[PDB]
Amino acid sequence: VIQWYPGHMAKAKREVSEQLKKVDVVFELVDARIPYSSRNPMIDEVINQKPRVVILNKKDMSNLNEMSKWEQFFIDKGYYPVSVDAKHGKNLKKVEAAAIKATAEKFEREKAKGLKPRAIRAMIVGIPNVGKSTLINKLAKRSIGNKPGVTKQQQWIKVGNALQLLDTPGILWPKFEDEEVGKKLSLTGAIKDSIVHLDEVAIYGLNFLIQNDLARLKSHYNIEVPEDAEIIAWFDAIGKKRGLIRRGNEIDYEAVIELIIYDIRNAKIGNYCFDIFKDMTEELANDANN
């Protein structure tokens, strides 16, 4: 859990840029469930045209078809997107491979200028909880000062044959300014942080599921709901079917809300990508020119 405040943000921007000076390529790590919404809002300014691998992590909890649209978008911006499951160690070879492709031009020009071949240097950057430390540990094949008061120095990790990975990620802040994006981040657990009302988060999730996977939502909770009912009816149906009640036979809404948020965060109902590319055309255009 990280506390952002005007100064701390400045600290992170500064420090991450400093680390970026040491590397040939940057791995922007995003959540495959929201490849666009889980990006730091100033990421391009911070990365500043550095060769970039965009890593859609938690592929195991998302939808491949939607992700592929996001991959196309990343390809169209000139990045090298790959998807991985850092936790269960799936597709990890792809990281080095993309790093090699991302820096192929740079090292060709170095080779032509007569420089000797060398390890590619990389770092990982992204908002919190996307799986940065998980990915680092999986790539190091080991868990990354042991004495109180003793400061750990940032070190290079040998990964594969051609890759050197900084063992410390650049941590940047999530998008703050948009309420829908807030709900997306809350649905994925990127922010388990207040002022975005949990009840509204659960309504957003239900409505997402009702629109994209109604059959699955119903079979999961074993409920059936009138199509012209308002959203409250769904809370009531689930609350009733799970027995989450209070004061006689009133619905314990706080409890149903928590169950919905949990089941969506932890992919109990299905594997979804909440960034629907075709629905985000205006948002994309707003960001696009800068």
Ligand SMILES: Nc1nc2c(ncn2[C@@H]2O[C@H](COP(=O)(O)OP(=O)(O)NP(=O)(O)O)[C@@H](O)[C@H]2O)c(=O)[nH]1
């Ligand atoms: N199913 C699944 N879970 C993952 C995957 N990657 C990370 N997780 C889980 O996501 C949660 C956060 O992972 P973590 O590595 O701590 O995130 P982080 O980006 O390092 N946060 P920080 O900014 O503090 O470094 C953990 O519970 C982790 O097990 C993944 O690829 N698949």
